[PDB]
């Protein structure tokens, strides 16, 4: 059920931070990623394989854990509004990022020619998003696994998620066979 | 055929001095606004206007939109347009207008105690029982008749929760966005209808499409009500021979400041 | 370089098969999951969590590697239309999986109440499709790293990815506090 | 009485096929622009219009301003309004337009190599010395006599504080917002004058008072010239019976998005 | 006013015996088909028909489509509508019709060897140089003046690469869906044009929306050319008083098998 | 000459305000259908039409066939044409339409409890005994009069076990064909007759010949009532000038969705 995904995401945040990712928390999500604020992170990550990163993102599923949260009864409208503003902010941020990959590619290439610059930018975006989610989770009070949902938040999430998925799908791009032979040997 | 301005039913129920009716003729249209343009500009710094939405197939569709009347040097109180129940009596100098206007405002903000006080204070005047009581009943009934339609609850709710006009994407640096839409719902139904019909979303969401009319918001919702001040910056300009001759009419692009705030989502089902 | 993606997808598939997933690959892509083929898989999976799974599928990213294999010059038209047909087939299979998720959930949970039911179903879908993809890769002949784009193939892939991702998006959901205590204490 | 458009002298220097002169009558006005509105909308994505600056004393002062001619889905070169020196030939594919158009564009960008190549290749054609030589001389002379006046006035502006036009993007963080101030300054005097008269600043400072018109930028300067890409967000929309019956003249408020970029400074003496 | 059928210019190149021309006036319509339906039905088991596409706002759009004429028990050779260049000579018994029809088929099939053989055989016959030389010259000129227009290439390719029609989206455990579309790319320009105009896509993709006009495939491209065979099952039936009286006209919904095969998508810019 | 629709006897038995009976002129015909076309399309997503079946001996024969009225984007409940007794009351909002319609449906689905509730609630109304009771008798009696013709049992069974219309040949992925066929047997005689005449067979067996008309099915039957879902694919499109000019009436073959389901076997003695 939902509690499984919630706890899994919490533990994933904790463990991924413990292994490699570290708080550069001076920067929030309100604006684009700041290469000047990530030179050290880029240099660190340049010495690893990032090819498992992919251009898509499960924004709807990613924010689904935060969906199930409330105290007993509707004490105030603060929770739902806070979440709505968060959702619209996230949608705008992702769309602007997707629209402006050329600017970031140029900016991060200026710091040096690195092969995995695309995956670097993608992970920068995701890490900023994760830190902002970490803070907003620090804001909230309590969650329950009763899985009582809200229709309006659900619809807003679905629509903005469709926009985000289409925006990332806009990604198109233009322009060692011994490894193919090795694969064919391995399968056979 | 019938005027639809809330203040159109204003009556100077002194039994001696008659009341005026300065409402503009257009108030009789079925726009949905419950205020005549003259009342709109007098009681608030607002001016009705329309924005058209075209297409590639030459289709017509349009919505209402408001306009500022506040200048630049005006600060603080003068910058409040539609205050909340907390700060309206102070900003509207209730001891200045007709008692009927005072009752109207107390009703607008659900100020029942002020209603009862004004009623039982008027009761003491001589000659009230003749016609002043019937006039006060007529005014109260007219106000309630205007109010009930806009309310979502009503008697038989004709609710259609299809327009997702959430009213807040401002990128407010402070992570306190949870106040804009937090308000605008604790208000009177008339206030909510007026603000909905007054300000048009900068970002439009229909089905799968996304539209942008203004790159950045213009007004903002705050605890003291709607305020016509773009956040984090000086206010926008408000203007209230040979070179001109050679510069003939060239689509002057009027410089007055409209209203722009919030996001609109529309499902396929809604009309 | 796209060849990074080539080798990355190849090695990810190879290692993912090596670790736990044993090839049960006789069935083709023209069909929906069959319980008889996956009962033991579900039973063994029950004890291993799969919440890592993302509901969405990177259709275009998944199918991009096999876009770029072609001997120089127009060696044969067969590869082009074969790839196009495979793309359409996978698209329709994904569409039908998304459309009829409830029936498959019921047909697979009839054998036992698990907490990863839909998770396991999506894993089965992805695993069977990936086995079919590995067989199709075993079908192909040779590749090149020259990275020549094809407008026709790319346009087809983009449109199909848009449709498929939207259909996946339409998937929705029916509308222990010490965990959050630990999370907040970690955050502070 | 005399037209002042560079394209107004466009002529097919073949002596056989007639040439077109679509320049509108307004191109005879010495208002400061140097393009006929027809050529402005044809070659560029611009449409002349004027904005009046009033005050509280009802005084008239108007300034030139331009308008978008791009939709939403157009990308790449289509988003460029005025290309830079390096990226003008590709966006204009000069090989497809008339040779006189190519010569005029080369003169505008001061592409001396292209002008010399066109001239010495035109030396080869037969009948050139008869009339095509004199036609090319007339075209070149007119182009020089239009360009020349601009360079002093642009130069003098680039000398002293009289009107400090800063193309610095507001809200410095913003987006790319490149300080292409010298890329503009790398434009020819005609291009610099055209862009100055086309786009107006968002903040204006007269004497000591401060005036603001837009809360955010509209266009942006890039290495590919002036591109109408709103910073930090999707581009704005460009539009290019019963309910309509009840909607009368209600201050239509044109929805097309005009140019707004940069910062201006006004000294007391300017008029 | 002028017929636009390839077979409409059939000429008996003997200068003695007259020739026939049974083309109906339908060939004068510029619908995209270049064969009078008489010749199409006579040579091929097809018939012109158009299926119009509607919308929600009452907008009209129509697209061409073919119709089967083969029977049920008819199997094999007769089942083929458009045979391939490999298997067209045998199925159409070129030794049966006039040599002009054979020339037309060979030019359509780009059988240059047959054209050269027919020309050099016609050289020998007595009286050929009198009139038959120029007769065959004009016939060949007309044939090529059609063929080039049919092909996308011509002197310069006037191709509208906007509508993407695949023609083979089927999946019935063929295991070689990639083989089903091997042809349609070896066909001549006119052959490809005619086959595309004849068969309509069961699935249509306009940008973001998906539409469907059939449940399952109708025909299929075979190595021996186009065949009026429905895959995955027995062939559908082909038809070639009281109850009728008591059941008046109720939209008969004609049952003759139409054409449905392949997949289509439209780009963003296409209109 | 006499009306033969179930909804023909629909009445608003208030003794003050009359009712509506917009049953189409075909309502009087003995077409075998027992619902007038207007009420059939309004209450159900069905459209009566005629399916002509010919032969090689030029023999005319037409069989009952319905047509879809549902779009594509509609999902779940809306795709369900004739719901079952367990899933019709929820989808048919009985408390919305007039009581007589509700009772009609209750009889249709054997909902005696709702008939008793309708009667006992109707007893409470004033003026009930005046004419309300007589009209409830009239409506109920006429409805039962239609029902008996529809129902096969009746008093004397006029059933001819000749048409083996089993209402499934689908080759479905799941081995539940014996279950889909197992359904349709819980439906009343009206429901079974209506579903029989609505859907035309795709496979028909008379004597020894095997008839086939569609390569694949059209709808499917579930316990939740008659639902329209093409097996294993997208939903078929529903529609609900120069090219038109150049394309004349060419056997348009309109693509409105016809129904198809079931395997038909006809004995030699059957007529």
Numbering used by the authors:
A (entry chain B), C (entry chain A): 490 to 664, 673 to 685
B (entry chain W), D (entry chain X), E (entry chain Z), F (entry chain Y): 14 to 253, 279 to 309
Quote the paper.
Baculovirus Autographa californica multiple nucleopolyhedrovirus (AcMNPV) has been widely used as a bioinsecticide and a protein expression vector. The DNA genome, along with the baculovirus basic DNA-binding protein P6.9 protein, is encapsulated by an enveloped, rod-shaped nucleocapsid; the major capsid protein VP39 and some additional minor proteins are known to comprise the nucleocapsid. Here, we show a 3.2 Å resolution structure of helical cylindrical body of the AcMNPV nucleocapsid, composed of VP39, as well as 4.3 Å resolution structures of both the head and the base of the nucleocapsid composed of over 100 protein subunits. Surprisingly, the C14 symmetric base had nearly identical features to that of the apical head, except for that in the central regions. Both the head and base could be further segmented into three parts: an outer shell, an inner layer and a central region.
At both ends of the nucleocapsid, the VP39 cylinder is constricted by an outer shell ring composed of proteins AC104, AC142 and AC109. Along the helical cylinder at the base (or head), three AC104 (VP80) subunits bind to the outer surface of VP39 at the end of the helical cylinder. AC109 sits adjacent to AC104-3 on the end of the VP39 helical cylinder and sterically blocks the elongation of the cylinder. AC109 appears to alter the conformation of the Thr163-Glu176 loop, elongating the “spine helix” in P-domain of VP39s at the terminal layer of the cylinder at both ends. This results in the formation of a disulfide bond between Cys169 of VP39 and Cys187 of AC109. Additionally, AC142 extensively interacts with a neighboring AC109 through a number of hydrogen bonds and salt bridges. These interactions result in fourteen AC109-AC142 hetero-dimers forming a “barrel-hoop” like structure, which tightens and constricts the capsid cylinder from 500 Å to ~400 Å in diameter. The inner layer of both the head and base is composed of AC101 and AC144 arranged with C14 symmetry. Interestingly, residues Leu243-His334 from each AC101, which is comprised of four helices and connecting loops, form a ring-like structure that encircles both AC144s in the inner layer. AC98 (38 K) is only found in the base as no discernable density corresponding to it can be found in the head. The N-terminal domain of AC98 interacts with VP39 and AC144, while also associating with genomic dsDNA. The interactions between AC101-2 and AC109 essentially bind the inner layer to the outer shell at both ends of the capsid.
